[PDB]
Design a binder for these strands. Structure first.
Ligand code: SF4
Ligand SMILES: O=P([O-])(O)O
Ligand SMILES: O=P([O-])(O)O
Length: 219
DNA sequence: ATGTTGCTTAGTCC
DNA sequence: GGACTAAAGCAACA
């Protein structure tokens, strides 16, 4: 199917009962946004359809993409990620605002699970379910040469996608693994506030990941 | 009030 | 694998 069909069918998905419930349950729970409209639906990927680089996240944040409708938009993860994409020369501007004209150059963003999960922890069954969408979405990104897993969950999801053994591809920040056709699989700590604010993942470390991804992608 | 909540990782154990 | 938990620094939240 083409992208329009992908977006149409994805947004109507209701395969995971716990997530169909949670994504609406959190609406109005955060003071700063009470009374505002929430997307509260599956989150479609965003970016360059001709991207050579794919940043693969974990899932929608309750008041992040689950609220704005765009990956990494409206929360601490995006506050960290988007300015860095611009600093690396991969976007039109530093900030991402729903409904703006932000363009990503050579990069596309999505995640393992597309509906906000409780405690940011999807179940093994929910991951297997949404993996069907990963197949469809990555299938619509023919030019990707570098797949960047943001966090352990994301890496494992990508390993399943490529039919790779976990034992041979452990999760460690900076890990680099080869993929068929001269492609690459990179692993980085997730951009979560828990990782950046605690010093586990610094702005320097992530920009480096981005610069390495560009290098490996021929950009 | 100032204590609680919410935002992954790495190690443990079966 | 999968379930469980102590640990990390910050600030909205109550
Ligand atoms: S998480 Fe994925 S599979 Fe589950 S309901 Fe949402 S879009 Fe569908
Ligand atoms: O809502 P996310 O894309 O920042 O997880
Ligand atoms: O932000 P607070 O401290 O007025 O609740």
């Amino acid at each position: 199917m083409d992208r329009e069909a992908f977006v149409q069918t994805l947004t109507a998905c209701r395969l995971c009962p716990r997530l169909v419930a949670w994504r609406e349950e959190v609406v109005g729970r955060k003071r700063a946004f009470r009374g505002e409209p929430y997307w509260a639906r599956p989150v479609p990927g965003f970016g360059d359809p001709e991207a050579r680089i794919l940043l693969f996240g974990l899932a929608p944040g309750a008041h992040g993409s689950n609220r704005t409708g765009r990956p990494f938009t409206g929360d601490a993860s995006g506050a960290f990620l988007y300015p860095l994409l611009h600093e690396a020369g991969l976007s039109s501007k530093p900030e991402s605002l729903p409904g703006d004209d932000l363009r990503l150059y050579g990069v596309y963003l999505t995640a393992a699970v597309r509906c906000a999960p409780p405690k940011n922890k999807p179940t093994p069954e929910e991951l297997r379910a949404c993996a069907r969408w990963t197949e469809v979405e990555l299938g619509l990104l023919p030019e990707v040469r570098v797949y960047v897993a943001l966090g352990r969950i994301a890496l494992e999801a990508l390993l399943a996608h490529f039919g790779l053994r976990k034992s041979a591809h452990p999760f460690r920040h900076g890990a680099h693994y080869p993929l068929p056709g001269g492609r690459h699989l990179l692993a980085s700590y997730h951009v979560s506030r828990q990782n950046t604010q605690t010093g586990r993942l610094t702005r320097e470390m992530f920009l480096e990941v981005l610069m390495e991804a560009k290098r490996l992608a021929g950009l």
